[PDB]
């Protein structure tokens, strides 16, 4: 196969939300992260990761669904698929990997009715759900 290629800054713009692992942050300063507000998070479209031996044992275990993480949502909501990527002029080098997120069912965001309440610095509604 003689592939036809395209840049990442051009394919992935600077508007779509992207799930970047905690290692790839300074190499991609133009992509927009997956913001969150009021306890609800956005839905990402791509996932950027480091190379194989780093992603396998440092970032896939740190951001795990069972210890908070961020890969607990995208395994329940989306499906990931690898894409073919090459580092220009330095073939044979492992730069990382890019992935594509496909929805399982077609759904649109909610509306989240709001309100306010004044606590007293010692109030606690109860513990969080951590482990079984």
């Amino acid at each position: 196969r003689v592939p036809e290629l395209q840049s990442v800054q051009e394919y992935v713009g600077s508007d779509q939300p992207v799930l970047m692992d905690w290692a790839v942050g300074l190499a991609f300063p133009c992509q927009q992260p997956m913001l969150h507000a009021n306890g609800v998070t956005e839905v990402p479209k791509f996932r950027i990761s480091p190379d194989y031996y780093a992603k396998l044992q440092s970032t896939d275990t740190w951001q795990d669904g069972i210890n908070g993480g961020l890969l607990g949502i995208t395994d329940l909501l989306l499906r990931a698929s690898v894409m073919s990527t090459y580092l220009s002029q330095d073939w044979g080098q492992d730069w990382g990997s890019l992935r594509k997120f496909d929805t399982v069912v077609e759904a649109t965001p909610a509306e989240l009715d709001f309100g306010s309440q004044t606590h007293s610095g010692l109030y606690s509604p109860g513990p969080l759900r951590i482990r079984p």
Partner: protein, 31 residues
């Protein structure tokens, strides 16, 4: 009538209340 007698009070007052006000910040209503 000497300013050392005034500084001696300005150092104890506003140095004790500035310390009892800092331990109450973690305990104060928030919205």
């Amino acid at each position: 009538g000497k300013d050392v007698r005034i500084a001696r009070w300005v150092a104890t007052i506003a140095g004790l209340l500035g310390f009892v006000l800092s331990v109450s910040i973690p305990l104060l209503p928030v919205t």
